[PDB]
Amino acid sequence: AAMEELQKSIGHKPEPTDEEWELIKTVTEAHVATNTQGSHWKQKRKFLPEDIGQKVDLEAFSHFTKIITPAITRVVDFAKKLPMFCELPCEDQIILLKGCCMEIMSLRAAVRYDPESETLTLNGEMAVTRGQLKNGGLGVVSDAIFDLGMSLSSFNLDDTEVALLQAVLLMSSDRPGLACVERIEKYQDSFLLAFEHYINYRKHHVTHFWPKLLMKVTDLRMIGACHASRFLHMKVECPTELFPPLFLEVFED
C-alpha cells in the first residue's frame, strides 16, 4: 500500500494485498449475482426475428424497452451490494446510478458479443444484430457498443475484471451534482488499485494491458454520453407511452 511507486520503479508488478483480495471478492460476487450466468446466455439466447429492425423502428424499440427495466434494476442491485456505495447519501446514490447505468449496461451487452453470429445478447436472453439495435433507437450508439464488443474479445475479461470495471464506472466523482466528491474518489482510486493489482496477478499475454483497458473506460463514458443524446431523439420519434417508468426516471432529469 505504501510501497507502490518504489515497487513499480524496480520492475515488480504488485499483486492484490489481502485487503484488496477481500474487496475483489465483494465486487465480483456483486456482479456475478446481478448478472447472467457466465457462458449460459450462449445456449439460452433467442435471436430476434430478422424481420424486426430492418426513423426509429418502433417494433424493435418495443422489444428493447420490454426488457430494459430488469436490465436497469440489475445495475441498481449491483450497486447495492457494494458497501462503499451504501456509505453514500441518497442524492449521491441516484446521481451516481443515473450516470453509470448505460455505461454498465453497455459493457454487459458488449462482453456478450458473438463473432460467429455477429450479435450481442441483451440480458443474455435476446440476441440482436448491429442493424437491429441501430434501427431500434440507438443509432450510432449501436455501432460503438458492437465495436467495443469486437475489441473486448482479445482482452479475455473474467467476471472479476468486468466487475471492477463496473465499480470504476460507478464511482465517478465528476458526476454533476455530487456532494461527496473526495470520498467517491477515494473509493474509485481504491477500486482502480485493486484492479491493476488483479491484472498483474492475471498476467494477460497482452502488451500494455492496463493502459488499453483504461481507454475502454473512456469509450464506455462516451457511449453513455452519446446515449443521453439518443434518448432525446427517442422522446421525439417515439410514442411517450412506450417508455417504461424506470427507463424515463433514470435517463432524464
Q: Footprint of ligand ARS on this chain (CB under 6 A)?
A: 80, 86, 90-91, 94, 140-141, 144, 180, 183, 222, 226, 229
CA distance 208 to 38: 26
107 binds ligand 4HY (CB under 6 A): no
- Ordered DSSP codes for 122-150: ETTTEEE-HHHHIIIIITHHHHHHHHHHH
The strand pairing partners of 122, in sequence order, are 126
Contact present, 152 and 146 (Cβ < 8 Å) = no
Number of residues lying near ligand 4HY (CB under 6 A) = 17
64 binds ligand 4HY (CB under 6 A): yes
* Shorter beta-carbon distance to ligand 4HY: residue 32 or 67: 67
Check whether 74 is labelled as a binding-site residue: yes
H helix intervals, the chain: 5-10, 18-34, 41-44, 58-66, 68-80, 83-86, 90-110, 130-133, 140-152, 159-170, 181-202, 209-237, 245-251
Contact present, 219 and 103 (Cβ < 8 Å) = no
Closest distance to ligand ARS from the beta carbon of 78 (Å): 11
220 binds ligand 4HY (CB under 6 A): no
97 binds ligand 4HY (CB under 6 A): no
Site string for ligand 4HY, 126-145 (x = CB under 6 A): ----------xxx------x
68 binds ligand 4HY (CB under 6 A): yes
CA distance 60 to 54: 9
Check whether 123 is labelled as a binding-site residue: yes
108 binds ligand 4HY (CB under 6 A): yes
Q: What is the largest CA-CA distance in the chain?
A: 61
From 102-110, 177-185, 187-195, 208-216, span contacting ligand 4HY (CB under 6 A): 102-110
Binding site for ligand 4HY (CB under 6 A): 61, 64-65, 67-68, 71, 102, 105-106, 108-109, 122-123, 136-138, 145
